[PDB]
Structures are given as C-alpha cells and as structure tokens.
Design a protein around this ligand. Structure first.
Ligand SMILES: *[C@@H]1O[C@H](CO)[C@@H](O[C@@H]2O[C@H](CO)[C@@H](O)[C@H](O)[C@H]2NC(C)=O)[C@H](O[C@@H]2O[C@@H](C)[C@@H](O)[C@@H](O)[C@@H]2O)[C@H]1NC(C)=O
Ligand SMILES: *[C@@H]1O[C@H](CO)[C@@H](O)[C@H](O)[C@H]1NC(C)=O
Ligand SMILES: *[C@@H]1O[C@H](CO)[C@@H](O)[C@H](O)[C@H]1NC(C)=O
Ligand SMILES: *[C@@H]1O[C@H](CO)[C@@H](O)[C@H](O)[C@H]1NC(C)=O
Ligand SMILES: *[C@@H]1O[C@H](CO)[C@@H](O)[C@H](O)[C@H]1NC(C)=O
Ligand SMILES: [Cl-]
Ligand SMILES: [Zn+2]
Lengths: 598, 194
C-alpha cells in the first residue's frame, strides 16, 4: 500500500537527479557565452537552456498529479508546490504565446531604444551608455531635460499599448492560479502557511511595507529638504524652496538612487574622502589579491575558504581583447559543487567592495548546497542581496581598511568625515526607499484595478509628487508609460525586493555587530574575526528556503518580522545632523508647484 | 609464491559501476600489503580489524577485491553501519566487517567535458541489500500502485541513474575509485600471505 506522500518523495528523488544534471549543462553553457561571446556559444547556450525549460515544463505537469492537500511533511510540500507553479501554462496556448511575444517586444524596445539629437538625425544614443552618461554626469538643466523627456517619449510611448495588454494577460494568469491579481501573485513570495508562530500572508506584506514606510518618512523628508536646499543654490531659477525636486535632476534616468548628487550636496566639502585605490596600486595588488583578501574576510568569521574549483574556473579579470565578455559582476552556483565568480576586476576600491559582496553570495550558495535542489535559494527574494550588502558594509569601514594595511593608521576619523560618509550612504540607500515603495504601490494598484487605464500617468505623477517629493518637468498624458521606461517594469520583475532587502540588511548588520561585541555607532562596525557573528549568520545561510523566511530571520536577529529600527539606528547620526541643518529650511513639499506651471 | 595480482585491480583502465560492482577472488599468492602507506596524494585507507603493518605477517585462505566508482561525497558510505543510496541499494558492508577500504580521486580518468555517463548507481529498490549482495536487475521500479509492465512512466522509474562526471565538479561530486578488501578464514588451508 503506497501513499501519495511516499509517491511524491520518490518522484522528487528522480527529479533531483535529473534536474541537477540538466541545470549544470544550462548554467555551464551560460557561463561559456558570458565569458567568451561568440555566435557558436549563443547556440549552445540556447540549446542547453531550451532542454532545461522543456524538462521543467514536463516535470511541473507531472508534479501536479500529486495533490498538495494530501501531503503532511512540510519540506516535501514546499518542494512540490515550487515545481507545481506552472505559471504561464495555466493560460490557453494562444494567450501564452501572446504574452511571451509581448514580453519579448517590451524587452527589446527597452534594450534597443534610441533617441537622436534634434540637430543630427544620424547621431543617436541608447540608454546604456548614452543616456545614462548624461543623467549621471551632466550639470546642464536642458541637456538632462532632453534626455529624460525624449527617453520617455520615444521609447515609453512605444511600451504603453504593450504594457496595457501585459496587465490583462498577467492578471488572467494570476487569477487562474487562484491569486487575486498579478500583484498578489508577486507578494506570494512572502507567504508562509501551516507553521504555527511563523505564518505570513500575502496581504500582510502591504501592511508591513506601509507601516515601516511611515517610520522612514521623517528621515526622508529631512534628507529631501537638505538636498533641495543645496540644489536650490546650484539652480536658483529652477527649484522652488517649497516644491518637489524636478525628476530629471536626481542623478540617474529615474531618480532611483540619488548617489550622483553627492558632489553638489557633500556636507563638508574639503575633508578628504576615503579612497584606497592609490594604496592598492602602490602595493601592486591585482585581481587575485582582492579575492584572496575577501576570502580571508569570510575565513576570519569561521566560514569556509573557496573551493579549489573556484580559483581555477572563475574569471576574475577581463580576458584581454580577443574574446569579449559580459562584465556585469555575478556570482554563479552551477551545482555539483561548482561555484564561480565572473567579474572584470579593476584594481580599485569599488571593485574591492564588490568582490566582498559577490563572494557573500557564493558563501550563501555553498552553505545551502546540502538542501535538496528546489530549496537552494535565499529564504525569500530579499535575503540574498541583503547578505551581499552587509559584506561590503564591514569591508569598507576605516577600521577594516586600516586593519588590512590599505589605510594609514594616521587617517583621522572625526564628526565630519562620518557625516559625509553617512550622507553618501543615505543618497543611495534612503533615497531609493520612497522611489521603490511608490513604484511598487503603483503596479499593485494597477493590477488590483484601482487605477483605470485613462488615469495611469495621472496617478503615477500624483504619487510621485505626493510620496516621493519628485515632480515631472513636462506634463505627460496617457500616451506615455513612464514606469515602463525603467528596466524592471518592462522586463517583468518584481520590485519590492529592493525595499525588503534594505531593511533586512541593517537588521542583519545590527545583529551580527552585537554578536561581534562592537563598540560605538553601528556604521563603524566591522565583523571581521568574530566567529560568533559568522556562526549566527551561518545558521540562517544553511537553511536555504527549507524554513519560513520569518524563522530564518529570527535565527539571525531574534525577531520574526521586517523592522525599520536598525536602519534608523544606522542613520541616526546623520538624522540629527540633518535636523539641525534644516532648522532654517522648509521641510516637506507642496505638490502643486511644477517646472512647467508658470 | 607468485605475486598477488593487485595491479590489475587497482591499475585497471575501467572500473565497474557500483550497482554492478566487480569482485576479484585472490588465491595462491604472496601479497606485500606494505606497498600501501605510500602514494599519499588522494589515496586514503581505513582498515577495520587489524593493522596493515600487522597483517603483512599473516595468512588467509581467500581474499576478495571489490572495486567500483562513486562520488567523493559517498565514499563515507563504504563503511560498516552506514546508510544512503550507496550503502542501501548498491554496495553494503556488514556490521562485523574485518577488512580494508581504499579510495582515491580519479577525476583525471573518469570525467570528461561532455559528461561521463559510463558509471551508474541504483537509486530505487523495494528493500535494502544484504551485505555483499549485488543487484544488476533493470526491472522498472513500481512507485505507484499500477503495474509498470516494463515501460517507464508516471510512478514507473528505471531504477539506474547515471553519474554525470565532468572535470569541473566539486570534490564531493567527482569520481572516486574504491577497492574493498575482505579476508576470510574457512576450514580450508591458507594460501594468501606476506
Ligand atoms: C520529511 O521527509 C524527509 C525526507 O523524506 C525526512 O528526512 C529524512 O528522515 C530520515 C529519518 O529516518 C533520515 O534517515 C533521512 O536522512 C532524512 N533525509 C533528509 C534529506 O533529511 C524528514 O524527517 C526529519 O528530518 C531528519 C533530518 C530527521 O531529523 C528525522 O527524524 C525528521 O523527522 C521528514 N519530516 C517529517 C516531519 O516527517
Ligand atoms: C572561445 O570560444 C571559441 C569557440 O566558441 C573557442 O574556440 C575558444 O577556445 C574559446 N576561448 C577560450 C579561452 O575558451
Ligand atoms: C581550506 O582550509 C582548510 C583548513 O586549514 C585547509 O586544510 C584547506 O586546504 C583549505 N583549502 C584551500 C584551497 O586552501
Ligand atoms: C584579525 O586577526 C588578525 C590576527 O590577530 C589581525 O592581524 C587582524 O588585524 C585582525 N583584524 C581585525 C579587524 O582586528
Ligand atoms: C600501479 O602502477 C604504478 C605505476 O606503474 C605503480 O607504482 C603501482 O605500484 C601499481 N600498483 C600496484 C598495486 O602494483
Ligand atoms: Cl518616471
Ligand atoms: Zn548582489
């Protein structure tokens, strides 16, 4: 007599063996292309990738013939559910094809969209590098305005009809899988059922995101007020002391991060910044040494060294000029004990921190390789990135840099270099939080039906002005689709992951630094040499996604939910500084001013 | 007084799959077991019962040499009182085992870039193996409660799975060659010495 649970276990054992081999061939084929861009390697990548997708669809369908309702073992149930999500294959074949066409057309418009200067019809720019170089480096108001506007009017207007059809089909797919819409389907990533004390509902994520966003508002308003005041000094005729910031003056194509405003906003503009690039060059470091130092970092907290295969098979430098490579830094888990990093490493401080971030992913990947295939991931979509981020926090601190001999002991840390550092951090980390929440709230509301088609762009800019404190420099009607002018929206990726990641990373860093007995402000903390910190982290890393993410979080930080207090703790010295700087300024924004309303 | 043909066991070009493990019976020869304690890189040895130095001055009636290939991760199962796919379904050592297990990494010989599918292991079986039992049957494993009639399908699995050996696998997934030495003392005279 053979139960369904016993039948499921046996089915998963077969799947695990077949999956691991087919996935390795796809991952390795992907590797050979990204490291050696040739027409031949595109084919092999697509052949092995297609064999992998075809196996998955076959195994998803076979998996559905075991009912979840009749499984008690939760780790079996989790694996069955993850393979059983057939996604697009719940639609008719006609609608699957329509949707996949739409997705592909939106993706290639985004990546091949071009604007041409209205002086030369043949001198044209793509987003990358052309328009992005304008938006991160230009100080000229009209040049930035031209890039911002023509990107949204040339490419975004193309995506508007496609995006309308994408919502309809994604909602049909979501509703046929018994979610209430595609947004609810995305929030499914945080769902936990059947584990008493650790359950978490899809609707609870909206509540926790909004409740935590309220507590971030005061720090954001003061950051916004300080930035607006400094830009008002640079652009006196373009910025109102009570209005929103114009959306094309934020340092990238969307105002997604405010990193590049640093040079116009640096609080103490003559204090030396910390850049250890010149010391690395003086000391003859290469890519090898950087990754050796990052390995020394994780070993010092009790995690393993890198495998022998990691050193032999990774690509840590640009492969010369004969072969071309995709140089975006990525950590690779191919299975079968094979872990690699791809990175076109230059001898700079940024690439030193990036090496630590990327090796953090590998550390996460190695620790859960003992889980079954389908549980080998971060506990939820925000965990992996959070693990990467906290590695670069420690590696960049003056304490760590002095410790490894890249920073002179005679370097003097004071009030002011910390305020400068914290401001630069805040421009990246805190400035993106209202951008990220606002964008995802808009998509959620569109998928729910709360924003009719004829009010998409109207509601987008009302929410930009009201939540983000940013205003469009040119009125946009409904022929526009400005959200889709951002990669993640037109390439069909969930976005709240950048919000939850940011809260997780300071929760992790606060927990680890307490375990490391760190003295003083949280932002000066280096967890190096703390085997207690390394162990506490490892107890969550090895879980993969075998446990509810709420439990995984409790393991590191002793609390079951996302929490803003550690983030505010990290930025408290800046917050009190901003509050005192702003005592002569207006804090907050009026939504009715705009650059074009005169 | 001929020398014991261990060379054709250890230096053999191709080992058996562990589900179909190979046994060579030794007789009427003199073995110098101190030939081990040497070739330190990736040769590991673990004896159960009597020291290698001490049995080189000892005589047995029959010696058996069992050889096969498994993943590095799985070598720990070639040991008494262990469980897992290998110890349950492919090669099982008895609780009261009185012999030696030699293992070495053979990535250079048993993996290739397209994947070596020469080596198989048994993944499903109704019951566990009795010690030193071999099962080479290829009958379709019945997981469900319908007969399979000899074709793979839903709940009907071919029970032999291929390792996939590629040279870029981690050490735990690389191939290891294993030799298992059993020594027995029956009523008949001893003919294997040192
Ligand atoms: C859910 O199914 C799992 C796999 O079928 C169980 O794990 C297996 O438990 C066996 C107990 O006899 C053990 O030999 C196996 O090695 C182990 N396999 C794996 C991959 O872990 C699991 O049982 C729990 O987990 C193991 C580690 C032991 O601690 C058991 O005593 C546990 O009950 C099953 N869980 C439940 C709640 O039934
Ligand atoms: C790059 O790819 C080509 C064919 O795709 C191959 O012949 C060549 O050896 C590769 N180069 C390296 C360094 O692997
Ligand atoms: C990793 O650390 C262990 C412990 O010292 C050591 O034996 C092993 O050889 C190290 N691995 C490498 C590749 O150095
Ligand atoms: C970690 O320990 C080593 C050995 O004492 C030391 O050289 C290094 O500076 C330590 N790092 C920190 C940050 O204290
Ligand atoms: C296997 O071959 C090597 C090299 O020819 C030799 O040193 C070794 O002794 C051989 N093995 C046995 C068991 O004789
Ligand atoms: Cl926009
Ligand atoms: Zn990352």
């Amino acid at each position: 007599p053979s139960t369904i649970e016993e039948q499921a276990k046996t089915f998963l054992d077969k799947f695990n063996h077949e999956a691991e081999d087919l996935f390795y061939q796809s991952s390795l084929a992907s590797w050979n292309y990204n490291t050696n861009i040739t027409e031949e390697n595109v084919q092999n990548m697509n052949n092995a990738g297609d064999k992998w997708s075809a196996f998955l669809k076959e195994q998803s369908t076979l998996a559905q013939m075991y009912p979840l309702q009749e499984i008690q073992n939760l780790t079996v149930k989790l694996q069955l559910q993850a393979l059983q999500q057939n996604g697009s294959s719940v639609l008719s074949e006609d609608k699957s094809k329509r949707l996949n066409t739409i997705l592909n057309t939106m993706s290639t418009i985004y990546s091949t969209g071009k604007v041409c200067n209205p002086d030369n019809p043949q001198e044209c720019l793509l987003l990358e590098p052309g328009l992005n170089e304008i938006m991160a480096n230009s100080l000229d108001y009209n040049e930035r305005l031209w890039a911002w506007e023509s990107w949204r009017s040339e490419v975004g207007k193309q995506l508007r009809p496609l995006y309308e059809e994408y919502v309809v089909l994604k909602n049909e797919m979501a509703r046929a899988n018994h979610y209430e819409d595609y947004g609810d389907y995305w929030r499914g990533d945080y769902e936990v059922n059947g584990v008493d004390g650790y359950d978490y509902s899809r609707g609870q994520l909206i509540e926790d995101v909004e409740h935590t966003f309220e507590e971030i508002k005061p720090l954001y308003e003061h950051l916004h007020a300080y930035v607006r005041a400094k830009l008002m000094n640079a652009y006196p005729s373009y910025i109102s002391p009570i209005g929103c910031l114009p959306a094309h003056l934020l340092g990238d194509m969307w105002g997604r991060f405010w990193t590049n405003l640093y040079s116009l906003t640096v609080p103490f503009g003559q204090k030396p910044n910390i850049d250890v690039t010149d010391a690395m060059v003086d000391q003859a470091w290469d890519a090898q040494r950087i990754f050796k130092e990052a390995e020394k970092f994780f070993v010092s907290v009790g995690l393993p060294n890198m495998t022998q295969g990691f050193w032999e098979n990774s690509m840590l430098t640009d492969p010369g000029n004969v072969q071309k490579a995709v140089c975006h830094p990525t950590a690779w888990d191919l299975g079968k004990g094979d872990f690699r990093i791809l990175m076109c490493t230059k001898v700079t401080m940024d690439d030193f921190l990036t090496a630590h971030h990327e090796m953090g992913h590998i550390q996460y990947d190695m620790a859960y390789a003992a889980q079954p295939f389908l549980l080998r991931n971060g506990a939820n979509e925000g965990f992996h990135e959070a693990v990467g981020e906290i590695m670069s926090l420690s590696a960049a601190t003056p304490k760590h840099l002095k410790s490894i001999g890249l920073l002179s002991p005679d370097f003097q840390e004071d009030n002011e270099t910390e305020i400068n550092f914290l401001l630069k951090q805040a421009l990246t980390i805190v400035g993106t939080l209202p951008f990220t929440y606002m964008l995802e709230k808009w998509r959620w509301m569109v998928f729910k039906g709360e924003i009719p088609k004829d009010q998409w762009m109207k509601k987008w800019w009302e929410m930009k002005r009201e939540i983000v404190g940013v205003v469009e420099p040119v009125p946009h009607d409904e022929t526009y689709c400005d959200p889709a002018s951002l990669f993640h929206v037109s390439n069909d990726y969930s976005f709240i992951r950048y919000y939850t990641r940011t809260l997780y990373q300071f929760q992790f860093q606060e927990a680890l630094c307490q375990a490391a007995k760190h003295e003083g402000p949280l932002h000066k903390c280096d967890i190096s040499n703390s085997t207690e910190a390394g162990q506490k982290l490892f107890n969550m890393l090895r879980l993969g996604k075998s446990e509810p993410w709420t439990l995984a979080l409790e393991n590191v930080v002793g609390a079951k939910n996302m929490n803003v207090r550690p983030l505010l703790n990290y930025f408290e010295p800046l917050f009190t500084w901003l509050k005192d700087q702003n005592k002569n300024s207006f804090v907050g924004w009026s939504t009715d001013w705009s650059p074009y309303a005169d | 007084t001929n020398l014991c043909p261990f060379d054709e066991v250890f230096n053999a070009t191709r080992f058996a799959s562990v589900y179909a493990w190979n046994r060579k019976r030794i007789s009427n020869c003199v073995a110098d077991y101190s030939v081990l304690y040497n070739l330190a890189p990736f040769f590991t040895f673990k004896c159960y019962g009597v020291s290698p130095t001490k049995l080189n001055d000892l005589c047995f009636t029959n010696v058996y040499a069992d050889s096969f290939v498994i993943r590095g991760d799985e070598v720990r199962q070639i040991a008494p009182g262990q469980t897992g796919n290998i110890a349950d379904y492919n090669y099982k050592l008895p609780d009261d085992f009185t012999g030696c297990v030699i293992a070495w990494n053979s990535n250079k010989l048993d993996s290739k870039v397209s994947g070596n599918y020469n080596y198989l292991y048994r993944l499903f079986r109704k019951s566990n193996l009795k010690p030193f039992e071999r099962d080479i049957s290829t009958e379709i494993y019945q997981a469900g409660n319908k007969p399979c009639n000899g074709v793979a399908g839903f709940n009907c699995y071919f029970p032999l799975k291929s390792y996939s050996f590629r040279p870029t696998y981690g050490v735990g997934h690389q191939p290891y060659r294993v030799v298992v030495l059993s020594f027995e003392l029956l009523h008949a005279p001893a003919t294997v010495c040192g």
